[PDB]
Amino acid sequence: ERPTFYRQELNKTIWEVPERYQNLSPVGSGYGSVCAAFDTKTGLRVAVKKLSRPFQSIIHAKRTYRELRLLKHMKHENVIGLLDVFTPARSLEEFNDVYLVTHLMGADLNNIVKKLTDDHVQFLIYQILRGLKYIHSADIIHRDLKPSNLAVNEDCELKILDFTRWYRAPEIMLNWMHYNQTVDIWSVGCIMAELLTGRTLFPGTDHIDQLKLILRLVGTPGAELLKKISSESARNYIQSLTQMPKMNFANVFIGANPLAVDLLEKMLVLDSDKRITAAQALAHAYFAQYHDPDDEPVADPYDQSFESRDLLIDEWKSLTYDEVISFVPP
């Protein structure tokens, strides 16, 4: 059957939600407004996102669909999945609103700014890499992995949400075609380092500064990597720099578990053809207490062909309605 909905005004809008969701209290805005709610069916605290202006234009409509499609695909312990999706619309003609329901998450990893033991750093990073092994196995690159994108409960069980530039890979930061899923492995590098030391690894002021800080730690590109650069003016720029050598990570990460340091040298690599993958990082000696290769699962492959399509508003909208309708909860 259809649920019983109830209406009520908050965030200057009249929210219409199933009666199972109780006690809606706003928790932010700017895409759509979220409310914290109590789900009476499951006993869970949940976030209900009402999308704003979901079909106002073609870009709104396509993005509306891209969000719903993605969330529907993610079925993993360490990745934010979709608990429910609804509209008060009773047919496609009157379909103009969309609500997304996800697990209400406690802190993010910024909140865990204030220092972590090695065992706990292992546990947090291992969960990110497990989540990332899944995500990447479906051909999805997160692209903006950072502490504010990583939610943890009380027990520090970690989920990745949301698929600053302090954690962005330098090839993603610089518009370099030469990239890979391991752009996310760079972000994990910067995150693990900060968990280890208590400070941001590369707190640049602009993109130049950032790059300068990066190259100071990892070294200026060496001939092998220079050969992978097709722009001459890019190549000239790079070799016009004052040449920096690769610093020893042991002397940046003082007293850190030596396996953590070794691992950080494998992530914080400028050439992404050489950067360690999530799958490989899970097998690093450093996660010995948490690694189990028959419980680090992969994804069904994710169809993104829709991204190349030039469709009308109404067709992105019907396409979204189909995804709403066919949704089966966990």
d(CA 240, CA 149): 36
Flag whether 29 is marked binding.
yes
Experimentally, the structure was elucidated by X-ray
167 and 227 inside one domain = yes
User: Domain range for residue 280?
Assistant: 107-298
Flag whether 28 is marked binding.
yes
Whether residue 286 contacts residue 122, with contact meaning beta carbons closer than 8 Å, is answered with yes
Order of strands, sheet of 107-108, starting from the edge strand that comes earlier in the sequence:
107-108, 150-152, 158-160
d(CA 228, CA 1): 58
Whether residue 202 contacts residue 252, with contact meaning beta carbons closer than 8 Å, is answered with no
d(CA 51, CA 116): 37
Flag whether 27 is marked binding.
yes
Domain boundary (79, 106, 133) is at 106
Residue 184 lies in a domain: yes
Which residue shows structure tokens 């999706």?
85
126 and 42 inside one domain = no
268 and 222 inside one domain = yes
Domain boundary (83, 106, 129) is at 106
Q: Which amino acid is at 182?
A: T
Strand pairing category for 84-86 and 99-103: antiparallel
Q: Which of 283, 268, 281 is nearest to 129 (CA)?
A: 281
After which residues, if any, is the chain broken (C to N > 2.5 Å)?
A: 30, 114, 163
185 and 294 inside one domain = yes
What was the resolution (in A) of this experimentally determined structure? 2.4
Q: Which residues are catalytic?
A: 162
Kind and range of the H or E run holding 135: helix 118-137
Flag whether 290 is marked binding.
no
d(CA 126, CA 18): 37
101 and 168 inside one domain = no
- CATH number of the domain encompassing residue 25: 3.30.200.20
- Which token pair is 247? 């610093």
Whether residue 205 contacts residue 256, with contact meaning beta carbons closer than 8 Å, is answered with no
Indicate the number of domains in the chain: 2
Flag whether 231 is marked binding.
no
40 and 125 inside one domain = no
Burial letters for 141-165: b for 16+ Cβ neighbours within 10 Å, e otherwise?
bbebbbbebbbbeeeeebbbbebee
The string of DSSP codes covering 247-277 is PPGGGTSTT--HHHHHHHHHHS-S-TTTSPP
Whether residue 221 contacts residue 214, with contact meaning beta carbons closer than 8 Å, is answered with no
